[PDB]
Design a protein around this ligand. Structure first.
Ligand SMILES: NC(=O)c1ccc[n+]([C@@H]2O[C@H](COP(=O)([O-])OP(=O)(O)OC[C@H]3O[C@@H](n4cnc5c(N)ncnc54)[C@H](OP(=O)(O)O)[C@@H]3O)[C@@H](O)[C@H]2O)c1
Length: 323
Protein backbone atom coordinates (compact mmCIF):
# COMPACT_ATOMS: atom_id res chain seq x y z
CA UNK A 1 0.00 0.00 0.00
CA UNK A 2 3.08 2.25 0.30
CA UNK A 3 3.62 3.32 -3.36
CA UNK A 4 7.14 1.82 -3.33
CA UNK A 5 5.60 -1.65 -3.39
CA UNK A 6 3.73 -0.98 -6.66
CA UNK A 7 3.69 -3.95 -9.07
CA UNK A 8 2.50 -4.57 -12.66
CA UNK A 9 0.59 -7.68 -13.79
CA UNK A 10 2.60 -9.83 -16.23
CA UNK A 11 0.96 -11.69 -19.15
CA UNK A 12 1.19 -14.99 -17.15
CA UNK A 13 -0.69 -13.60 -14.10
CA UNK A 14 2.35 -12.99 -11.88
CA UNK A 15 3.23 -9.50 -10.59
CA UNK A 16 6.49 -7.61 -11.00
CA UNK A 17 7.52 -4.62 -8.86
CA UNK A 18 7.98 -1.52 -11.03
CA UNK A 19 11.38 -0.60 -9.52
CA UNK A 20 14.21 -3.14 -9.47
CA UNK A 21 17.65 -3.28 -7.86
CA UNK A 22 20.55 -3.88 -10.25
CA UNK A 23 23.29 -6.08 -8.73
CA UNK A 24 26.12 -6.17 -11.34
CA UNK A 25 29.48 -4.92 -10.06
CA UNK A 26 32.70 -5.24 -12.04
CA UNK A 27 35.09 -8.05 -10.96
CA UNK A 28 37.48 -5.77 -9.05
CA UNK A 29 34.83 -4.95 -6.42
CA UNK A 30 35.01 -7.28 -3.34
CA UNK A 31 32.52 -10.15 -3.74
CA UNK A 32 31.09 -9.73 -0.25
CA UNK A 33 29.97 -6.17 -1.08
CA UNK A 34 26.97 -7.61 -3.03
CA UNK A 35 25.73 -9.19 0.21
CA UNK A 36 25.81 -5.89 2.09
CA UNK A 37 24.25 -3.64 -0.57
CA UNK A 38 21.47 -6.15 -1.34
CA UNK A 39 20.57 -6.25 2.37
CA UNK A 40 20.63 -2.43 2.34
CA UNK A 41 18.40 -2.33 -0.75
CA UNK A 42 15.83 -4.64 0.90
CA UNK A 43 15.88 -2.46 4.06
CA UNK A 44 15.27 0.57 1.78
CA UNK A 45 12.21 -1.17 0.31
CA UNK A 46 13.48 -2.78 -2.90
CA UNK A 47 11.84 -6.14 -3.61
CA UNK A 48 12.68 -6.74 -7.29
CA UNK A 49 16.34 -7.84 -7.52
CA UNK A 50 18.06 -8.35 -10.91
CA UNK A 51 21.03 -10.70 -11.36
CA UNK A 52 22.55 -13.25 -13.78
CA UNK A 53 25.07 -16.08 -14.14
CA UNK A 54 27.36 -13.55 -15.86
CA UNK A 55 27.49 -11.22 -12.84
CA UNK A 56 29.24 -13.90 -10.73
CA UNK A 57 27.30 -12.83 -7.64
CA UNK A 58 24.36 -15.23 -7.18
CA UNK A 59 25.86 -16.84 -4.07
CA UNK A 60 26.18 -13.40 -2.46
CA UNK A 61 22.79 -12.02 -3.61
CA UNK A 62 21.12 -15.27 -2.47
CA UNK A 63 22.81 -14.99 0.94
CA UNK A 64 21.42 -11.45 1.38
CA UNK A 65 17.89 -12.52 0.35
CA UNK A 66 17.89 -15.56 2.67
CA UNK A 67 19.40 -13.57 5.51
CA UNK A 68 16.51 -11.06 5.19
CA UNK A 69 14.00 -13.96 5.14
CA UNK A 70 15.73 -15.51 8.21
CA UNK A 71 15.66 -11.93 9.38
CA UNK A 72 15.38 -8.35 8.28
CA UNK A 73 11.99 -9.55 7.56
CA UNK A 74 10.70 -10.07 4.11
CA UNK A 75 9.01 -13.32 3.04
CA UNK A 76 10.13 -15.24 -0.07
CA UNK A 77 6.86 -14.30 -1.83
CA UNK A 78 7.60 -10.55 -1.29
CA UNK A 79 10.90 -10.85 -3.20
CA UNK A 80 10.98 -10.88 -6.99
CA UNK A 81 14.32 -12.37 -8.05
CA UNK A 82 15.50 -12.35 -11.70
CA UNK A 83 18.31 -14.46 -13.15
CA UNK A 84 19.42 -14.82 -16.77
CA UNK A 85 20.56 -17.75 -18.92
CA UNK A 86 23.92 -16.88 -20.43
CA UNK A 87 24.62 -17.40 -24.16
CA UNK A 88 26.92 -20.43 -23.73
CA UNK A 89 24.05 -22.51 -22.24
CA UNK A 90 21.52 -21.99 -25.07
CA UNK A 91 21.67 -25.56 -26.33
CA UNK A 92 18.40 -27.20 -25.10
CA UNK A 93 20.13 -29.92 -23.02
CA UNK A 94 22.06 -27.36 -20.92
CA UNK A 95 19.27 -24.81 -20.29
CA UNK A 96 17.70 -26.55 -17.28
CA UNK A 97 21.01 -27.53 -15.65
CA UNK A 98 22.10 -23.87 -16.02
CA UNK A 99 18.99 -22.73 -14.07
CA UNK A 100 19.45 -25.49 -11.46
CA UNK A 101 23.11 -24.45 -11.06
CA UNK A 102 22.05 -20.82 -10.33
CA UNK A 103 19.43 -22.06 -7.87
CA UNK A 104 22.16 -24.17 -6.15
CA UNK A 105 24.34 -21.04 -5.64
CA UNK A 106 21.30 -18.97 -4.56
CA UNK A 107 20.02 -21.73 -2.27
CA UNK A 108 16.49 -20.80 -3.39
CA UNK A 109 13.86 -23.20 -4.78
CA UNK A 110 12.82 -21.00 -7.70
CA UNK A 111 13.52 -17.74 -9.49
CA UNK A 112 10.66 -15.31 -10.13
CA UNK A 113 12.00 -14.57 -13.61
CA UNK A 114 14.49 -16.28 -15.93
CA UNK A 115 15.63 -14.40 -19.05
CA UNK A 116 17.50 -15.32 -22.21
CA UNK A 117 20.34 -12.78 -21.67
CA UNK A 118 20.86 -12.07 -25.38
CA UNK A 119 19.47 -13.55 -28.62
CA UNK A 120 23.00 -14.79 -29.47
CA UNK A 121 24.37 -18.31 -28.83
CA UNK A 122 28.07 -18.64 -28.06
CA UNK A 123 30.37 -21.70 -27.90
CA UNK A 124 29.55 -23.99 -24.92
CA UNK A 125 32.13 -24.00 -22.07
CA UNK A 126 33.17 -22.34 -18.80
CA UNK A 127 34.39 -19.09 -20.43
CA UNK A 128 31.43 -16.72 -20.91
CA UNK A 129 33.14 -14.93 -23.83
CA UNK A 130 35.10 -17.77 -25.49
CA UNK A 131 37.71 -16.53 -27.97
CA UNK A 132 39.81 -18.02 -30.80
CA UNK A 133 43.60 -17.77 -31.48
CA UNK A 134 43.02 -14.18 -32.76
CA UNK A 135 40.84 -13.06 -29.81
CA UNK A 136 37.59 -13.09 -31.83
CA UNK A 137 34.55 -14.42 -29.86
CA UNK A 138 33.44 -17.91 -31.05
CA UNK A 139 29.75 -18.15 -31.99
CA UNK A 140 27.33 -21.10 -31.97
CA UNK A 141 24.18 -21.92 -33.95
CA UNK A 142 21.06 -22.83 -31.99
CA UNK A 143 17.36 -22.73 -32.87
CA UNK A 144 16.09 -20.26 -30.21
CA UNK A 145 12.66 -21.91 -30.43
CA UNK A 146 14.20 -25.10 -28.93
CA UNK A 147 15.96 -23.06 -26.22
CA UNK A 148 12.58 -21.42 -25.49
CA UNK A 149 10.80 -24.80 -25.23
CA UNK A 150 13.15 -25.70 -22.38
CA UNK A 151 12.47 -22.34 -20.69
CA UNK A 152 8.77 -23.26 -20.84
CA UNK A 153 9.66 -26.66 -19.35
CA UNK A 154 11.49 -24.84 -16.50
CA UNK A 155 8.35 -22.77 -15.78
CA UNK A 156 6.21 -25.93 -15.84
CA UNK A 157 8.70 -27.63 -13.46
CA UNK A 158 8.26 -24.73 -10.99
CA UNK A 159 11.90 -23.64 -11.22
CA UNK A 160 11.01 -20.25 -12.76
CA UNK A 161 7.67 -18.54 -12.01
CA UNK A 162 7.90 -16.45 -15.19
CA UNK A 163 10.16 -16.44 -18.28
CA UNK A 164 11.33 -13.61 -20.55
CA UNK A 165 14.03 -12.24 -22.81
CA UNK A 166 16.68 -9.57 -22.77
CA UNK A 167 18.18 -7.44 -25.57
CA UNK A 168 15.84 -8.80 -28.25
CA UNK A 169 14.73 -6.80 -31.23
CA UNK A 170 11.16 -6.74 -32.52
CA UNK A 171 11.70 -9.39 -35.22
CA UNK A 172 13.43 -11.65 -32.68
CA UNK A 173 10.51 -11.30 -30.24
CA UNK A 174 8.19 -12.09 -33.14
CA UNK A 175 10.10 -15.33 -33.84
CA UNK A 176 9.09 -16.47 -30.31
CA UNK A 177 5.57 -14.98 -30.43
CA UNK A 178 4.87 -16.76 -33.76
CA UNK A 179 6.42 -20.11 -32.75
CA UNK A 180 4.15 -23.08 -33.46
CA UNK A 181 2.94 -24.66 -30.23
CA UNK A 182 4.05 -21.69 -28.12
CA UNK A 183 2.93 -22.35 -24.56
CA UNK A 184 4.20 -19.25 -22.71
CA UNK A 185 5.12 -15.94 -24.30
CA UNK A 186 7.87 -13.75 -22.84
CA UNK A 187 6.66 -11.66 -19.87
CA UNK A 188 9.27 -9.04 -20.65
CA UNK A 189 12.08 -7.73 -22.79
CA UNK A 190 14.81 -6.18 -20.67
CA UNK A 191 16.63 -3.59 -22.82
CA UNK A 192 18.82 -0.51 -22.52
CA UNK A 193 16.48 2.44 -21.98
CA UNK A 194 17.09 6.03 -20.86
CA UNK A 195 16.34 9.53 -22.19
CA UNK A 196 19.03 9.29 -24.94
CA UNK A 197 17.63 5.92 -26.14
CA UNK A 198 14.00 5.95 -25.08
CA UNK A 199 12.89 2.83 -27.07
CA UNK A 200 9.55 4.45 -28.20
CA UNK A 201 9.09 2.08 -31.07
CA UNK A 202 10.08 -1.14 -29.28
CA UNK A 203 8.02 0.01 -26.25
CA UNK A 204 4.97 0.49 -28.49
CA UNK A 205 5.55 -2.94 -29.99
CA UNK A 206 5.90 -4.62 -26.57
CA UNK A 207 2.76 -2.93 -25.21
CA UNK A 208 0.78 -4.09 -28.31
CA UNK A 209 1.94 -7.65 -27.55
CA UNK A 210 1.39 -7.47 -23.75
CA UNK A 211 5.16 -7.68 -23.03
CA UNK A 212 6.65 -5.45 -20.30
CA UNK A 213 9.64 -3.37 -21.27
CA UNK A 214 12.19 -3.43 -18.44
CA UNK A 215 14.82 -0.67 -18.64
CA UNK A 216 18.42 -1.58 -17.88
CA UNK A 217 21.13 1.08 -18.04
CA UNK A 218 18.37 3.55 -17.02
CA UNK A 219 20.92 5.98 -15.52
CA UNK A 220 23.31 5.79 -18.52
CA UNK A 221 25.29 2.77 -17.25
CA UNK A 222 28.09 2.48 -14.70
CA UNK A 223 30.48 3.40 -17.50
CA UNK A 224 32.85 0.48 -17.10
CA UNK A 225 35.32 -0.12 -19.94
CA UNK A 226 34.45 -3.80 -20.30
CA UNK A 227 31.04 -2.81 -21.78
CA UNK A 228 30.97 0.97 -22.33
CA UNK A 229 33.23 3.49 -24.10
CA UNK A 230 34.33 6.23 -21.62
CA UNK A 231 34.26 8.84 -24.41
CA UNK A 232 30.50 8.37 -24.61
CA UNK A 233 28.37 11.25 -23.22
CA UNK A 234 27.60 11.29 -19.49
CA UNK A 235 23.78 11.05 -19.21
CA UNK A 236 23.51 12.33 -15.63
CA UNK A 237 25.60 15.43 -16.45
CA UNK A 238 23.09 16.56 -19.10
CA UNK A 239 22.17 20.21 -18.33
CA UNK A 240 18.45 19.69 -19.19
CA UNK A 241 18.20 16.67 -16.84
CA UNK A 242 19.98 18.75 -14.17
CA UNK A 243 17.61 21.73 -14.65
CA UNK A 244 14.61 19.46 -14.08
CA UNK A 245 16.33 17.84 -11.08
CA UNK A 246 16.84 21.29 -9.60
CA UNK A 247 13.26 22.47 -10.32
CA UNK A 248 12.05 19.41 -8.39
CA UNK A 249 14.82 19.56 -5.73
CA UNK A 250 15.78 15.98 -6.61
CA UNK A 251 18.79 14.55 -8.48
CA UNK A 252 19.31 13.78 -12.18
CA UNK A 253 19.17 10.05 -11.42
CA UNK A 254 15.74 10.41 -9.80
CA UNK A 255 14.45 12.31 -12.82
CA UNK A 256 15.70 9.53 -15.17
CA UNK A 257 14.05 6.79 -13.07
CA UNK A 258 10.75 8.73 -12.72
CA UNK A 259 10.67 9.29 -16.50
CA UNK A 260 10.40 5.50 -16.97
CA UNK A 261 7.78 4.95 -14.26
CA UNK A 262 5.46 7.57 -15.79
CA UNK A 263 5.70 6.03 -19.33
CA UNK A 264 4.82 2.49 -18.15
CA UNK A 265 8.39 1.11 -18.19
CA UNK A 266 9.65 -1.08 -15.34
CA UNK A 267 13.03 0.36 -14.35
CA UNK A 268 16.22 -1.01 -12.79
CA UNK A 269 18.68 1.04 -10.77
CA UNK A 270 22.10 -0.18 -9.69
CA UNK A 271 23.86 1.39 -6.70
CA UNK A 272 26.48 -0.03 -4.36
CA UNK A 273 26.42 3.17 -2.27
CA UNK A 274 24.14 3.27 0.82
CA UNK A 275 23.00 6.92 0.39
CA UNK A 276 22.15 6.51 -3.34
CA UNK A 277 20.33 3.22 -2.70
CA UNK A 278 18.08 5.14 -0.25
CA UNK A 279 17.79 8.05 -2.69
CA UNK A 280 16.68 5.84 -5.58
CA UNK A 281 13.59 4.48 -3.75
CA UNK A 282 12.47 8.13 -3.42
CA UNK A 283 11.42 7.92 -7.10
CA UNK A 284 7.98 7.11 -5.54
CA UNK A 285 7.90 10.38 -3.54
CA UNK A 286 7.57 12.94 -6.38
CA UNK A 287 5.96 13.35 -9.81
CA UNK A 288 7.09 14.80 -13.12
CA UNK A 289 4.66 17.09 -14.93
CA UNK A 290 3.41 16.31 -18.43
CA UNK A 291 5.53 19.28 -19.57
CA UNK A 292 8.66 17.69 -17.97
CA UNK A 293 7.96 14.41 -19.77
CA UNK A 294 7.72 16.03 -23.20
CA UNK A 295 11.07 17.80 -22.58
CA UNK A 296 12.62 14.47 -21.51
CA UNK A 297 11.18 12.81 -24.67
CA UNK A 298 13.10 15.51 -26.59
CA UNK A 299 16.43 14.25 -25.25
CA UNK A 300 16.04 11.12 -27.37
CA UNK A 301 18.93 10.74 -29.80
CA UNK A 302 19.35 7.00 -30.49
CA UNK A 303 22.57 6.86 -28.49
CA UNK A 304 23.41 3.32 -27.32
CA UNK A 305 25.97 2.65 -24.56
CA UNK A 306 25.90 -1.21 -24.40
CA UNK A 307 26.79 -1.86 -28.03
CA UNK A 308 28.49 -5.28 -27.56
CA UNK A 309 30.56 -4.44 -30.64
CA UNK A 310 32.74 -7.59 -30.32
CA UNK A 311 29.51 -9.50 -31.16
CA UNK A 312 28.59 -7.31 -34.19
CA UNK A 313 29.41 -10.15 -36.61
CA UNK A 314 27.03 -12.61 -34.88
CA UNK A 315 24.15 -13.48 -37.28
CA UNK A 316 21.64 -12.69 -34.47
CA UNK A 317 23.24 -9.40 -33.34
CA UNK A 318 20.14 -7.47 -32.19
CA UNK A 319 21.06 -3.78 -32.53
CA UNK A 320 21.63 -3.30 -36.29
CA UNK A 321 17.86 -3.44 -36.98
CA UNK A 322 16.06 -0.13 -36.50
CA UNK A 323 14.33 -1.58 -33.44
N1 LIG B 1 20.32 -7.64 -19.52
C1 LIG B 1 21.44 -7.03 -19.84
O1 LIG B 1 22.05 -7.27 -20.87
C2 LIG B 1 21.92 -5.98 -18.87
C3 LIG B 1 22.92 -5.07 -19.26
C4 LIG B 1 23.34 -4.07 -18.39
C5 LIG B 1 22.79 -3.98 -17.10
N2 LIG B 1 21.79 -4.88 -16.71
C6 LIG B 1 21.15 -4.84 -15.36
O2 LIG B 1 20.86 -3.44 -15.18
C7 LIG B 1 21.38 -3.05 -13.93
C8 LIG B 1 21.62 -1.56 -14.11
O3 LIG B 1 22.64 -1.32 -15.09
P1 LIG B 1 24.00 -0.58 -14.72
O4 LIG B 1 24.47 -1.04 -13.40
O5 LIG B 1 24.89 -0.71 -15.89
O6 LIG B 1 23.81 0.98 -14.68
P2 LIG B 1 22.69 2.04 -14.22
O7 LIG B 1 21.66 1.53 -13.31
O8 LIG B 1 22.29 2.74 -15.46
O9 LIG B 1 23.61 3.12 -13.48
C9 LIG B 1 24.48 2.79 -12.47
C10 LIG B 1 25.44 3.91 -12.25
O10 LIG B 1 24.66 4.99 -11.69
C11 LIG B 1 25.25 5.32 -10.39
N3 LIG B 1 24.10 5.77 -9.56
C12 LIG B 1 23.12 4.99 -9.06
N4 LIG B 1 22.26 5.74 -8.39
C13 LIG B 1 22.69 7.02 -8.47
C14 LIG B 1 22.21 8.24 -7.97
N5 LIG B 1 21.07 8.25 -7.24
N6 LIG B 1 22.92 9.37 -8.23
C15 LIG B 1 24.05 9.34 -8.96
N7 LIG B 1 24.54 8.20 -9.44
C16 LIG B 1 23.87 7.03 -9.21
C17 LIG B 1 25.88 4.04 -9.90
O11 LIG B 1 26.94 4.37 -9.03
P3 LIG B 1 26.93 3.90 -7.50
O12 LIG B 1 27.03 2.29 -7.57
O13 LIG B 1 28.33 4.39 -6.93
O14 LIG B 1 25.78 4.37 -6.72
C18 LIG B 1 26.43 3.43 -11.18
O15 LIG B 1 27.74 3.96 -11.46
C19 LIG B 1 22.62 -3.94 -13.79
O16 LIG B 1 23.05 -4.01 -12.45
C20 LIG B 1 22.00 -5.26 -14.17
O17 LIG B 1 21.15 -5.70 -13.09
C21 LIG B 1 21.36 -5.88 -17.60
Amino acid sequence: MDPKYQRVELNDGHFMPVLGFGTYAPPEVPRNRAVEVTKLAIEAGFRHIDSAYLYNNEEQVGLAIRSKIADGSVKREDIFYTSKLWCTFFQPQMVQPALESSLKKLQLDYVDLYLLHFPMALKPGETPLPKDENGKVIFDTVDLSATWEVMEKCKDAGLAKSIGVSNFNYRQLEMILNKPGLKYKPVCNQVECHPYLNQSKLLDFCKSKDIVLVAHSALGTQRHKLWVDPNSPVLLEDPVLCALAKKHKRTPALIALRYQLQRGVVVLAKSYNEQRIRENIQVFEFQLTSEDMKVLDGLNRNYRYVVMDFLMDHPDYPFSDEY
